[PDB]
Write a protein that binds this ligand. Structure first.
Ligand SMILES: *[C@@H]1O[C@H](CO)[C@@H](O[C@@H]2O[C@H](CO)[C@@H](O[C@@H]3O[C@H](CO[C@H]4O[C@H](CO)[C@@H](O)[C@H](O[C@H]5O[C@H](CO)[C@@H](O)[C@H](O)[C@@H]5O[C@H]5O[C@H](CO)[C@@H](O)[C@H](O)[C@@H]5O)[C@@H]4O)[C@@H](O)[C@H](O[C@H]4O[C@H](CO)[C@@H](O)[C@H](O)[C@@H]4O[C@H]4O[C@H](CO)[C@@H](O)[C@H](O)[C@@H]4O)[C@@H]3O)[C@H](O)[C@H]2NC(C)=O)[C@H](O)[C@H]1NC(C)=O
Ligand SMILES: CN(C)c1cc(C(=O)N2C[C@@H]3CN(C(=O)c4ccc5[nH]nnc5c4)C[C@H]3C2)cc(OCC2CCOCC2)n1
Ligand SMILES: [Ca+2]
Ligand SMILES: [Ca+2]
Ligand SMILES: [Cl-]
Ligand code: NA
Ligand code: NA
Ligand SMILES: [Zn+2]
Length: 805
């Protein structure tokens, strides 16, 4: 109940919300059915429209008008945005040449440059080029300020998950808004776009920018606008707020546009009907900038133009139906569309089986347009698992397609020609970022970056301390003229041991054998230098990784590779080696096929054993440094040390062997040498964070050898490929992957074929950032380079996408 019989006189677009049943006059009251009786009359004036004409200049102030052209309007803060242009011979902002804004030029009383966040729904990255002729204001912001060629949304590339990621710097799994539609089993409650449940504060985790500002005594404009409030009225309201006295004035403001998303759904991303919505958005930008210029704020305010996600061509006829695969379709609930999430229809049904549903959905039709996953098996780059609201069974849908339960769902809900939600690496889903103002750089391009990074920068722009989030603070410093945040490298927590020869061969009873009893002092000092680290500067190019948690580990040197060997996990945390362009690939000699050798620097008690692999009928083993890339027949024996061995399912050894035998050399030849760091990952609770010992759900049978959930590699070389990886004088180039360690290759529908037809495609799907691996391992890479730390932070957030132009 709201007693809607109070008044909005003098309260129009008030900043503090009032508590029911008192009637509201804020920009959200409509959405709550709670506005005072006179809200439209007083607060939503429309008389005479939004522009001054010649004949209104100097007019007598008529309060009924939407905006004013009277003499007193500038000091009242309520002129039409084109007032000075029409009535005072001023130019439109877009017609002025751009001049660098070296320092903020603010009216007295301003303590900091305000921030205006202009968000556009469904604004695909390529609109910046393809619509440039009809968006002159946006094009001026873009070319005069700082821009990226695109910004990466989070998965799923839906509206609410991305708007709230923008607000919090959090992944949807952490902020809780994991779709436009959700079921929370603990609350037993459902969230949807339409309706009241979504207003309950319990859905919304983390700490969004407006709360962060408020707690730190920076005042915030109310960020959300009722859908019926016209864009012109939003702009005028913001401009009026910017004329409040110093003590009442917000420092941060938000504008949100439903376009071009609304039209893109109807007409597709490049439908000819799309030109008009783009023109209209640009006109709104022009109104804001002309209004700021009137207030002399156009060289004071930092403006961010940002999208939530792109738009892809999708039609009703491109729908896969679960009823074409599953026998018991009525025993499931699907969240449908551009992603799929499946749960049991009834919790009282003990006949329900996820394993059979997955099997019924796996590679069933020659060009099936979705792939099922248990959520813990999704690519780790999506960070889409650690939330009770994310159903165990997930469908990744091909771009341009929909999934539905039954055909009746499509025609008893073609309307739409566009949709979004797909994998966030998909080109059509990428969106836009422009920063313009005193604090942003002038005429500067920056590389694509992820939207999780923006919260930190919005905090920097306002002098705020960000709440803990998933951005990497400092990685977007290169966007900014000043207000940079100067991060320090984390402190190493565990120091390594450097073991020498300490054990005799006969102390080991590991059940391993090697044909290596084949015997010279010229070369005997040599093997010794190599074991003491003589070639370490060749193979460890960026310093050893730092271990950021408490543990016991050994640095082990070899001719061809260096490793950090964990006495707790019984295997390396990391193995580092450099492969030059000239390197040659050799095979494993026949006699050495099953060779595993005791490492006399490491005690039997802290070693794996071959017996466990023999007894374990499911598990085999592989090596982190590959024997194929040994520098000499003698160096090869090092690759067979028990300390270089890791557990691997036979199915996974197909992937791993092909990566090591074929792909490393291919990368080295293409990138002019590569430095490789590989290792195991344990993430049994799928939280994207390093497991402790007590979280490991699986061991090699009859032993304490933990089974990794994933294996990673980080492949670095010189950005200037005319320089070899091991002699690079400047910026680096990286690509990385986190491959799931699976007992089958069900994920790859072509896996019965030669590895050359499917393995590289798998690896590409599982591309990762160095930062993702840091989280999953507790390691810190690139500790000793010649590069600035902010630049290294940028490198660590880079994702190699494998999408064309
Ligand atoms: C991306 O960035 C984010 C943000 O930094 C990272 O997430 C953080 O990671 C931390 C480690 O996982 C986690 O810390 C835990 O916090 C517990 C208290 O949490 C509450 O308070 C905070 C602070 O305001 C709040 O943010 C939390 O919000 C969550 O929960 C509410 C609802 O409950 C949601 O609305 C909200 O969306 C958010 O949910 C998300 O996080 C939770 C986990 O907290 C998930 O379960 C959800 O799915 C969702 O992802 C909370 O309201 C604290 O109690 C924990 O402490 C335990 O463990 C420590 C080890 O240090 C131990 O000392 C303690 O004893 C304790 O154990 C006891 O409790 C156990 C659980 O019941 C029990 O099993 C034991 O036996 C013990 O009794 C812990 O410190 C932090 O909360 C989140 N923050 C956020 C915002 O998610 C994230 O990791 C980053 N991702 C990547 C890939 O890097
Ligand atoms: C509730 N959330 C968080 C939040 C909310 C807003 C906000 O007012 N609305 C009103 C809009 C109504 N609405 C759709 O009707 C809609 C639109 C497109 C769709 N495609 N498919 N279904 C769709 C449904 C979407 C809603 C977002 C705006 C904001 O901005 C957050 C800012 C944070 C800082 O960076 C820029 C954005 N956050
Ligand atoms: Ca949207
Ligand atoms: Ca974990
Ligand atoms: Cl959804
Ligand atoms: Na075995
Ligand atoms: Na297969
Ligand atoms: Zn949409």
């Amino acid at each position: 109940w709201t007693a809607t019989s109070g008044s909005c006189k003098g309260r129009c677009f008030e900043l503090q919300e009032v508590g029911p049943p008192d009637c509201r006059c804020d920009n959200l009251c409509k959405s709550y059915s709670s506005c005072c009786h006179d809200f439209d009359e007083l607060c939503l004036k429309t008389a005479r429209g939004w522009e001054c004409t010649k004949d209104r200049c100097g007019e007598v102030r008529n309060e009924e008008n939407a905006c004013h052209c009277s003499e007193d309007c500038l000091s009242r803060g309520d002129c039409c945005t084109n007032y000075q242009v029409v009535c005072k011979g001023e130019s439109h902002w877009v017609d002025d040449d751009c001049e660098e804004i070296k320092v903020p030029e603010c009216p007295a009383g301003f303590v900091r440059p305000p921030l205006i966040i202009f968000s556009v729904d469904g604004f695909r990255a390529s609109y910046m080029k393809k619509g440039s002729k009809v968006m002159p204001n946006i094009e001026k912001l873009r070319s005069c300020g700082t821009h990226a060629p695109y910004m990466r949304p989070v998965y799923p590339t839906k509206t609410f998950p991305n708007l709230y990621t923008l607000a919090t710097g959090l992944y949807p799994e952490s902020h809780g808004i994991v779709g436009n539609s959700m079921y929370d089993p603990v609350f037993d409650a459902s969230f949807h776009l339409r309706g009241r449940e979504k207003f309950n504060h319990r859905w919304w985790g983390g700490q969004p920018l407006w709360i962060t500002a408020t707690k730190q005594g920076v005042r915030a404009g109310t960020f959300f606008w009722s859908v019926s409030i016209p864009h012109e009225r939003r702009i005028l309201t913001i401009l009026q707020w910017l004329s409040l006295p110093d003590n009442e004035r917000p420092s941060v403001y938000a504008f949100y546009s439903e376009q071009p998303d609304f039209s893109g759904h109807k007409y597709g991303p490049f439908g000819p009907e799309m030109t008009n919505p783009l023109r209209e958005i640009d006109k709104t930008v022009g109104q804001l900038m002309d209004g700021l210029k009137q207030l002399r704020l156009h060289r004071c305010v930092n403006v961010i133009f940002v999208g939530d996600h792109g738009m892809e061509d999708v039609t009703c006829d491109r729908t896969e139906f679960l009823s074409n695969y599953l026998t018991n379709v009525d025993d499931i609930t699907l969240v449908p569309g551009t992603l799929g999430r499946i749960r049991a229809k009834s919790i009282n049904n003990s006949k329900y089986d996820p394993k059979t549903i997955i099997a019924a959905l796996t590679c069933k039709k020659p060009d099936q347009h979705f792939k099922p996953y248990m959520k813990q098996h999704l690519p780790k780059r999506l960070h889409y698992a650690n939330n009770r609201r994310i159903e165990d069974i997930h469908l990744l849908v091909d771009r341009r397609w929909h999934v539905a339960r039954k055909p009746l769902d499509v025609y008893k809900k073609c309307f739409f020609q566009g949709d979004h939600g797909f994998d966030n690496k998909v080109n059509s889903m990428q969106t836009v970022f422009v920063g313009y103002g005193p604090t942003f750089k002038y005429r500067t391009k920056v590389p694509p970056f992820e939207n999780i990074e923006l919260y930190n920068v919005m905090c920097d722009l306002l002098g705020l301390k960000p709440a803990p989030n998933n951005g990497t603070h400092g990685s977007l410093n290169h966007l900014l003229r000043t207000n940079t945040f100067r991060p320090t490298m984390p402190d190493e927590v565990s120091r390594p041991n450097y073991p020498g020869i300490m054990y005799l061969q006969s102390e080991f009873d590991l059940g391993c054998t090697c044909d290596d009893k084949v015997e010279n002092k010229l070369e005997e000092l040599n093997k010794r230098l190599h074991t003491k680290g003589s070639t370490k500067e060749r193979h460890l190019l960026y310093g050893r990784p730092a271990v950021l948690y408490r543990t016991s580990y050994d640095i082990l040197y070899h001719t061809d590779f260096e490793s950090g060997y964990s006495e707790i996990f019984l295997m390396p945390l990391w193995t580092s080696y450099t492969i030059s362009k000239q390197a040659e690939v050799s095979s494993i000699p026949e006699h050495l096929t099953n060779c595993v050798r005791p490492d006399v620097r490491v005690s039997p008690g802290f070693s794996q054993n071959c017996l466990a692999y023999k007894n374990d009928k499911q598990m085999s083993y592989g090596f982190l440094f590959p024997p194929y890339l040994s520098s000499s027949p003698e160096a090869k024996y090092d690759a067979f040390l028990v300390t270089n061995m890791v557990p691997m399912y036979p199915a996974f050894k197909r992937v791993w062997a092909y990566f090591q035998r074929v792909l490393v050399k291919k990368y080295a030849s293409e990138r002019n040498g590569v430095n490789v760091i590989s290792g195991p990952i344990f993430d049994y609770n799928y939280d994207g964070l390093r497991d402790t010992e007590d979280e490991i759900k699986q061991y090699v049978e009859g032993s304490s050898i933990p089974v990794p959930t994933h294996y990673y590699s980080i492949i670095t070389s010189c950005l200037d490929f005319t320089q070899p990886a091991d002699k690079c004088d400047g910026p680096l180039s990286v690509s990385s992957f986190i491959l799931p360690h699976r007992p089958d290759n069900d994920e790859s529908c072509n896996s019965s074929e030669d590895e050359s037809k499917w393995v590289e495609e798998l690896m590409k799907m599982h591309t990762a950032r160095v930062r993702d691996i840091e989280h999953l391992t507790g390691l810190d890479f690139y500790r000793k380079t010649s590069r600035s730390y902010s630049e290294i932070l940028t490198l660590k957030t880079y994702l190699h996408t494998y999408e064309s132009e």
